[PDB]
């Protein structure tokens, strides 16, 4: 298992514009298009992103391309972030994937907001951090996905995904 397969499980793949759990316009593998309510604003962002007139629909290849960009940008974002970088550097390979997953879902800023949890992960206090991460809107809104990520931080294995 790797970051790509993990995220593909959590986000799914959709070739037509859709609304995410929060009601936002998304496409492909969790690629947010706009927080704007206008389907038209979404279609425009889409065309801008792909470089063609898509009319709200993309191919598998296009979805995967966006996905590669998004994962890359998530990693680079962590590395450039003063709060995130040190945590990432301290983690083992599997746990690093769990942090990337959070950043992909909620943006750098949002994850950087989890001050206490980040501190616990850095200290390698697995059980304590899992308990603290669960006390969040994130967990209450998307509990199955959050649990999977949390188990990953807790155990340092891919068990939560070997099911799926």
Curated annotation (Swiss-Prot):
* Catalytic residues of the enzyme: 11, 20
What induces it, per record?
Expressed late in the viral replication.
Which consequence is recorded for altering residue 132 to I?
A: 5-fold decrease in enzymatic activity
Which Gene Ontology MF annotations are present? Answer: lysozyme activity
Determine if Zinc is one of this entry's keywords: no
Query: CDD domains from the entry?
Result: T4-like_lys (cd00735)
Pfam families registered for this protein in UniProt: Phage_lysozyme
The alphabetized list of GO BP terms reads: cell wall macromolecule catabolic process; defense response to bacterium; peptidoglycan catabolic process; viral release from host cell by cytolysis
| Enzyme Commission code(s) on record | 3.2.1.17
Result, substituting residue 11 to N: Loss of 84% of enzymatic activity
Q: What protein family is recorded? A: Belongs to the glycosyl hydrolase 24 family.
What is the designated name of this protein?
Answer: Endolysin
Offer a single GO CC term for the protein.
Answer: host cell cytoplasm
Q: Provide the species name.
A: Enterobacteria phage T4
